[PDB]
Design a protein around this ligand. Structure first.
Ligand SMILES: O=C(O)c1cccc(N2C(=O)C(O)=C(C(=O)c3cccc(C(F)(F)F)c3)[C@@H]2c2cccc(C(F)(F)F)c2)c1
Length: 124
């Protein structure tokens, strides 16, 4: 049966070091956007092909954002959270002020919208 978003997330997580890193959140974003555009199969194929060519899994994930057309010139998704503390420890130092026109294929993984109005971009 078809690969699900959760299955793909787990496959990608299996290749990443650490826990709750910016790359883990990029997996989340790739899987959610991929699910919503019925593109999980090509995303998985690009991931596996990059690994097969010898790329690191980090590089494979970035290549997805540049080579799978749903991500080309796409803005990062907005994720609503309560406070900065909801964001995983390993992501904290990757949080930045949000620039004008952030793009996933330029390393802006997602934008966190905090409950008090603050906004932070997650950068790789
Ligand atoms: O319902 C699905 O089919 C599905 C598929 C793939 C991913 C997820 N997600 C989650 O279940 C989830 O917890 C999402 C995380 O990105 C997330 C969601 C909230 C807070 C945080 C934080 F810990 F980084 F702060 C992370 C994540 C997610 C949900 C909504 C939107 C995104 C997106 F904005 F694309 F990054 C990600 C859901």
């Amino acid at each position: 049966p078809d690969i699900s978003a959760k299955d793909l997330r787990n496959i990608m997580y299996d290749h990443l070091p650490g826990f709750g890193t910016a790359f883990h959140q990029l997996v989340q974003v790739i899987c959610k956007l991929g699910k919503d555009s019925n593109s999980l199969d090509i995303i998985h194929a690009e991931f596996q092909a990059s690994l097969a060519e010898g790329d690191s899994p980090q590089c494979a994930l970035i290549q997805i954002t540049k080579r799978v057309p749903i991500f080309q010139d796409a803005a990062p998704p907005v994720i609503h959270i309560r406070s900065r503390g909801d964001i995983p420890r390993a992501c904290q130092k990757s949080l930045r002020p949000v620039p004008p026109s952030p793009k996933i294929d330029r390393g802006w993984v997602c934008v966190f919208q905090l409950q008090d109005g603050k906004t932070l971009g997650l950068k790789i």
